[PDB]
Each structure stands twice: as C-alpha cells, then as structure tokens.
Amino acid sequence: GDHITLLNVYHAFKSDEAYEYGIHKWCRDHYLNYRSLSAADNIRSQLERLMNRYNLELNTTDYESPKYFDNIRKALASGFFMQVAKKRSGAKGYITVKDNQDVLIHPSTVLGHDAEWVIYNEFVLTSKNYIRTVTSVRPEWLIEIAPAYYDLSNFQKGDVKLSLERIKEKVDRLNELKQ
C-alpha cells in the first residue's frame, strides 16, 4: 500500500510529537513538503465540513483490529475498481483491467514485493507507460464490490487477466458449493 503510507505520513504530521519537534522543522527533517501537507490539511478540513453538511458519518476502527488495512483497501476499491492492474503470470510488467494496456509500476511506489493484483490512482506517460500510486488488493474484494464491472461477459476473450480471473471465479463457486 502506497495509500496506507500516505495515511501514515499525514497521521504523523498531525501527531503531537511532530508539533513538539518543530512541524516545519520536522518536515524539513523527514524529507517532506510542508506546503503540500498543510494544503492537504486544508482540503481535508473542507471535505470534512462537506461530509458533515451532507450528513456522512465519520467512522473508524482500531489499529489493533486486523481488518483495519483491509477495510481501507476495500473502501479504496469501492471507488477505484475500474483502475486495477494485474502482473503478467510468469513474466515481467503489469497490464490494466481497463482497455487492456501494458504497463509498469512507478519507481516511487513503496511496494518492493510483487503483488499480482493492485489498485492504482494515477496513469502517467513518460519514458515508459507507468502506473503511479498503488495498493495491493484481493480480486475477491473487487468481485464483491463491483460485480457489474467484473462479470466475465464484459471482457475480451482469453487473456492473462481473464484466465486467472476465471480461476478466482471457480474458487468462489467452489466456496459456495461447499456451503
């Protein structure tokens, strides 16, 4: 998770400790942009005011609970299910679920290990076709959240994505079969 990392960054910036150090000094000690962080605080305040205005509950769970990161990831998939990449089975590089394009992971991404299923935030073209800001996800969650987009009927014939997506489907159906 890159998103989780961002959450850690903001949570550390808004921490009492960072205020006891020198906030701006603390930002200039941890290689962070103060302008971006304060702008983020502002935007967050605005969005919070709007959520309170249109009556959306501010809810959270304990870090002790193992379903914390999972909840966050799921909520991420709720809005970014159309932007999902799958690593080539037994090869190099990734490929997008949407429009089926060959892609790679941006060098600034935290994930050092090969997670075969990822949700991304930005699509960027430079030296190569790069995917920026990602977070590992389970295909099960994707099927659960957006069944409308992840019905097998929607996607082109037997390609790397569909081949193991259908395996995940076989899995799901076996799970249902055993109950």
């Binding site: 075969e116 076989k170 076996l174």
Partner: protein, 107 residues
Amino acid sequence: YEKYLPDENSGKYLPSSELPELNFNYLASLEKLQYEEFMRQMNGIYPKWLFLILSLAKYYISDSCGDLLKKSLQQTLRSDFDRIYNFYLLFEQECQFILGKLKENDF
C-alpha cells in the same frame, strides 16, 4: 472390440470414441496408454480435473515444466493437497518459481 484383439483401425475406433461419454474416450485413451502424454495433456486441457491430475502426475512420474503444468492445474482446479504436491515439486527440485507454486495456496 470383438472384431480384433487389437492395428490402425482400433486407433480409428478410439478416435471415434474420443470425437464423441467421457468414459468412452478415457478407456480408449487407456488402451492407447511422450506424444501420448501430449494428447493426454490435450485431454486435460479439454477439462474430471482430478482424473486429469492423475493422468498428469502419472505423466510426470512415468519434468519441471510438467511440474509447472501441474501447478497450473492447481491454479485452475481447486488446498493443502496442492501444498503437498508442491512439496513434491520442491523435493524434486529446490530451485525460482516454487514460490509461485506456493502462491496458489494463498495461511
């Protein structure tokens, strides 16, 4: 079968048996039983995933690429038994795709 104890015409009989009752093809494939392993692999590709797994494991035990094929079968068919066969592939060759074979189990 009454016509003869066994040569090509019997293969034609097995061919008609395969072209159209899966047992009718599997029996002829049994009497026919590396090219046979390839045709049997095509039969597994047609898919009784368990029986096909038996045909494949027999094809390997008769190979690391074949172990990759059985790992693909684990990726398709079906988990602890897959971990056991993966243990067999691991003992057979402790070398770097084995972690991917473990990945099918994915506690």
